[PDB]
Amino acid sequence: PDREKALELAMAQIDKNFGKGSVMRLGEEVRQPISVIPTGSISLDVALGIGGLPRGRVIEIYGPESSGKTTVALHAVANAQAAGGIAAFIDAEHALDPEYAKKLGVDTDSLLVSQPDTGEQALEIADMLVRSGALDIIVIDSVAALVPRAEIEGEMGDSHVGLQARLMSQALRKMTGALNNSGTTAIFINQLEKIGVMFGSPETTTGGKALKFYASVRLDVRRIETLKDGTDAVGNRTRVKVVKNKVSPPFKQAEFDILYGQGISREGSLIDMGVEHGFIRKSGSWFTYEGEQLGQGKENARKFLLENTDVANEIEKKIKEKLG
Ligand SMILES: Nc1ncnc2c1ncn2[C@@H]1O[C@H](COP(=O)(O)OP(=O)(O)O)[C@@H](O)[C@H]1O
Q: What b/e readout covers 100-137, taking b as 16+ CB neighbours within 10 angstroms?
A: bbeebebeeeebeebebebbbebbebbbebbbeeebbb
Which residue's CA lies nearest to atom 1 of ligand 1?
100
Instruction: Please indicate, yes or no, if residue 16 is contained in any of the structural domains.
Output: no
CATH number of the structural domain spanning residue 315:
3.30.250.10
245, 276: one domain: no
What is the distance between the alpha carbons of residues 27 and 13, in angstroms, rounded to a whole number?
A: 20
Structural domain harbouring 46: 24-264
Q: Answer yes or no: are the C-beta atoms of 148 and 186 closer than 8 Å.
A: no
Rounded to whole angstroms, how far apart are CA atoms 273 and 236? Answer: 17
Which residues are part of a known binding site? 66-71, 97-100, 191
Please state, in angstroms and rounded to a whole number, the distance separating the CA atoms of residues 261 and 268: 15
Is there a domain that residue 5 lies in? no
Same domain, 134 and 124: yes
Residues 189 and 311 in one domain: no
Residues 67 and 203 in one domain: yes
155 and 300 in a single domain? The answer is no
Helix/strand/coil (H/E/C) assignment for every residue in 236-267: EEEEEEEEEEECECCCEEEEEEEECCCEECHH
Tell me whether residue 19 is in a domain.
no
Classify residue 43: in a domain, yes or no. yes
**290 and 258 housed in the same domain:** no
242 DSSP β-pair partners:
219, 252
**End-to-end Cα, the chain, rounded Å:** 29
d(CA 187, CA 170): 17
Ligand 1 atom at shortest distance from the alpha carbon of 72: 18
Residue 291 DSSP label:
T
Experimental method: X-ray
138 occurs within a structural domain: yes
Mutate to test the pocket of ligand 1, among 258, 259, 262, 264 (most ligand atoms within 8 A of CB): 258
Look at residue 254 and tell me if it is in a domain. yes
Report the distance separating Cα 10 and Cα 287, nearest Å. Answer: 49
| C-alpha torsion sign, points 41, 42, 48, 54 | positive
Q: Which residues are annotated as a binding site for ATP?
A: 66-71, 97-100
Lining residues, ligand 1, CB within 6 Å:
65-71, 97, 100, 235-236, 258, 260-261
10 Å Cβ neighbour count for 278? 8
Residue 110 lies in a domain: yes
For residues 248 and 52, the answer to whether their CB atoms sit within 8 Å is no
Nearest CA to ligand 1 atom 13: 66
Strand order in the sheet with 263-264: 112-114, 86-91, 135-141, 185-191, 58-63, 217-226, 235-245, 252-259, 263-264
Look at residues 239, 264, 289 and tell me which one is the last residue of a structural domain.
264
Report yes or no: 97 and 263 within 8 Å, Cβ to Cβ.
no
> Counting Cβ atoms within 10 Å, is residue 298 exposed (0-12), middle (13-18) or buried (19+)?
middle
Last residue of a domain, one of 264, 287, 305: 264
Residues 205 and 298 in one domain: no
Nearest to residue 123, comparing CAs of 110, 101, 138?
Answer: 138
Does residue 118 contact residue 148 with C-beta atoms inside 8 Å? yes
Residues in Cβ contact with 235 at an 8 Å cutoff, skipping those fewer than 6 apart: 226, 227, 257, 258, 259, 260, 262
Do 77 and 87 form a contact (C-beta atoms < 8 A)? yes
Q: Is residue 17 in some structural domain?
A: no
Q: How many domains does the chain have?
A: 2
Instruction: Say if residues 141 and 96 touch (Cβ distance below 8 Å).
Output: yes
> CA–CA separation, 62 vs 316, rounded Å?
27
Q: Which of 244, 264, 284 is the last residue of a domain?
A: 264
Rounded Cα distance, 86 and 77, in Å: 9
